[PDB]
Each structure stands twice: as C-alpha cells, then as structure tokens.
Amino acid sequence: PEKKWLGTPIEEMRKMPRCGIHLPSLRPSASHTVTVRVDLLRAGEVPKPFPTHYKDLWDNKHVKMPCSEQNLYPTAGSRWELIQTALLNKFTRPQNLKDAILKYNVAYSKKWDFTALVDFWDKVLEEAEAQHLYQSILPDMVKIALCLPNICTQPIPLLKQKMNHSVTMSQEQIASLLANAFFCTFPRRNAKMKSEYSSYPDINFNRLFEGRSSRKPEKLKTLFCYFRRVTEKKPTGLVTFTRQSLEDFPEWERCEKPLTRLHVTYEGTIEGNGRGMLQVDFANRFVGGGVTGAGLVQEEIRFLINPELIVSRLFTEVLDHNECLIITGTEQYSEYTGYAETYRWARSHEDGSEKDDWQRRCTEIVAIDALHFRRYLDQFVPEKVRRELNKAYCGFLRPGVPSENLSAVATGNWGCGAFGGDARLKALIQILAAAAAERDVVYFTFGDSELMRDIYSMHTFLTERKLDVGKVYKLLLRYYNEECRNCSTPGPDIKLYPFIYHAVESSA
C-alpha cells in the first residue's frame, strides 16, 4: 500500500510564528493604511479606532460608505437615516427582514428573491434556534451595523490594479462592515450595468437569500455561526489585506535557483495541516469567487469558515495576471464536512492560533487565480506556462524578507479538474515558482495517492540530478516544441513526466 506522505517530514518545514521576522512597530505610511490606534493596541483588548471620530471620503479612491452624508435617496434625503429606521424594527418572521432590506433597495424589490432566507428561517432551523436568530442575533447584528461610523472612522482605500498597498483593520471593524454587507447596505454595488464597481466582486449578501439550492442553508448556518461569535464576544485581533502587483519576474529560462524541499501527501487539508504556513486560496480573479452567490468549492469554503476574508471583496479590484491578494490574521469560526453539493456546516470552531506582534493571528492566505483551460494543450504553450509561473511567484514572493523567515507554501491541485489544468504540470509550476521565491512546498493531493507518488518521484529525480529552475523550464519548452506544438489530438501521445525522465536519461 502507498505511504500517506513522502519527502521532507512536515515538522522540519518552516512555519509561523517561529520562523517570523521581528516586526517593526505598526504605523501608517504611504504603502500601509492602518485604521486603529496603534499606541493603545494591546493583547486581548478590542482595538480603538483612528481617527477618534468618523471622517468621510466619497470619491473614486475609497469605499463609498453606507453612513456617508453623500449617500442619498429620493426630494433628496439621507439613505443612512433610512437604513437606521428600516433595521431598528422588531423581526419575528423572515418577511420582516426582507421588507427591511428592501426599504433602501427599492429598485431590486422584484430582482432579489428571498426564498432561501425564508426556507432557512421557517423550515431548516428548529423553533428555538429561529427564536434566538430573531430575538438576539439579528438585533445584535443591527447594532454593530448601525455603529459603522463609530467603529470604522477612517476612509478605506480601494486596492486597485497595479497598487502595492496594505490595509490593516480590526476584526471588530470587519464585523461591522460584514453586518452591513449582510443587510445589503453598500451603495453602488448592486446594479448589473454598474460602472465604477463593475471590476469589483459583489459585497452585499443578497444572493445568499435567493433560490431553492440546499447549499444556501449551509452558507447561512456558517455565516450565522460567525455573526453569533463576534456579537457575543468581540474579536480583539487585527487583519492585514495586501495587494501585491509585480511588473518584473524571473528570467525563467536562465534562473539558477535550486529546487527547494517538498512534503507531499494525499491526506490532510491546507487549512488543517498547513497551520502557520502560506496557504493558497485557489482563487477566482474576483477574490472569493461565488461566496456571496452560488459557488461552494475550495475558495468559497475558505471564505465562509474564515469570513473576515469576505470583506476583501469590498475594496479589492479584480486581479490582473501579475497580481495577488495576501491576507494575514483571519480567524476560523466554523468547521465543516464535505464539499460543493455535500458541503455541510459541522460546528463552531474555537481558533487557538497564536498572534504576532501586531495582534494578527498566525494565519496567512494568498488568493492566486489559475487560468481556465478550455483547450487542454493551451497550458503547455510557453507563454501560458510563464503566466502561471509568474502568478504563483507573485503569490509566494515577499520582497525584503530573508528566505529563512519565510514559511513553507501549503498548496495543492491549483486550477485543475474541471477548470482544465493538468495536475502534474501545475504541481511542477508551483514547485518552480516556490524555488524562485526560495520557499519550501507542502503539497496536498486530496486523496490522489498516485499523484502524490508521481510528484515526489519527479521532485526527487530533478533534485538528485541537480537541475535548477532554468533547466527544468527548458525541459518544459522541449515538451512543448517536441510533443504539443504539432499535436493534432487533444493530448500528446507522451505525457510530460515520462518525457522529462527520458529527456534527462538520454542527455549528457
């Protein structure tokens, strides 16, 4: 029988907090928006907002806040005043919640279906659970939502394409923002022919309430677990959201960097067994994918069990080819079983992760989007090999951080299966990108033991024969030119790994 794991023992890999740099003092800069008082930041205490009182920016460089005095509705009145009046009502039946949300979303009264919300409230939840939802949870959520201007006093910049910028806010600030997202209060984020925000993911939660899918009740359970936790016991930590956009990449053909360590296994999970490691989110270029709609695979699941990730959709413009989003400090509030149609909320999770010197949990997640390959051979074209190498490299590289202070990358089959990526090519691409960024690799194959063995065997071969990144890249070019370029069938007769073995064994 196959071994459960191969390569370097996982305990020898680097992880946070042990491997981490000594952090300088947290402070605002041109590259770093910080929305809390760093001088009074203390372990186990809710951070204070900075500035002390609300400041509004209503412009194309910042989030358009629901509490803005420029948020107007039909003479021209205050939409925030209307939101307060709508939400400060007793909820006893799901229609009451629908009617509240639609008071300040009149244009969508016909377009937004609330069937899933109604079924969740009336049929899925037991009577006692329903009562708790409308008697405590929903009112408590309204309270933190309407406190937005007192909690989020600082304008939140949009993380636009090409920006290298970080935003660090408190988990409490995120809770208030996400409660607003639940009640669908964010202006200009709803229209299908919207202009300014057409390049941003959805933030308002309206699509969680629609339709008859059995998935919706599980999403609502997972999110209500979160909202219950944060309203009963306010979170005290911070979270950093960092957009990274690289213009320059390794000259892959000539790269002399050696391959790094590999641990590869067909058991375990990125979030469970990659604790303290750089955890890859197999992203959509709109970060979070269909979390607030119909999607429920790797990304969306992560965005539901660590829901502070969802707030990134408020201010993160769609990723370009050379970009990623890095999120440090999100907390796990839920446990789940299954996947996609079998996904179920299992129970609450009590996150026991340590926090760094900026009070961020030692959980780092990077959203990198693979290309979708609707024609299989396209991914072996050198330009597309380089696109994926560069995307992964952007996700892994940390400018100005010594290699010894970098955790292993915890990843797996990125953009494979129905997205069209070849697992064996994609594994080698990530290994090369990690090598270029001088990080080790922990690779989860999710039940595919043959794939685990093949990845380990290839890494071992390449490592023992001392082929550096450039040598392996040149072998990929050889495969393209010799077996793919002139291939009249959907796939070549000889596979990549066999081709590499024979290429090297027939060489000098």
Numbering used by the authors: 442 to 515, 524 to 957
Question: What does the original paper state about this entry?
Answer:
We purified and crystallized the recombinant mouse PARG catalytic domain (residues 439–959) and determined the unliganded structure of mPARG(439–959) using Se-Met SAD method at 2.0 Å resolution. A nine-strand mixed β sheet is sandwiched by two helical domains. The N-terminal helical domain has nine α helices, whereas the C-terminal helical domain has five. The core structure of the mPARG catalytic domain also has an ADPr-binding macrodomain fold, despite missing the first β strand of the macrodomain. Tyr788, a residue previously identified to be important for the recognition of the PARG inhibitor ADP-HPD, is located at the tip residue in this β hairpin pointing into the cleft. The very N-terminal segment of the mPARG catalytic domain contains the sixteen-residue putative mitochondrial targeting sequence (MTS, residues 454–469, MRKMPRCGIHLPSLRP) and binds to a groove on the side opposite to the active site. In our mPARG structures, this MTS together with residues preceding it, has an extended conformation and wraps along the back side of the PARG catalytic domain. The MTS docks in a hydrophobic groove on the back side of the β sheet, which is the opposite side from the active site. Hydrophobic residues Met454, Met457, Leu464 and Leu467 on the MTS pack tightly with this hydrophobic groove. With the first crystal form that we solved mPARG structure (space P1), both methods failed, since the active site cleft is close to another copy of the mPARG molecule in the crystal lattice.
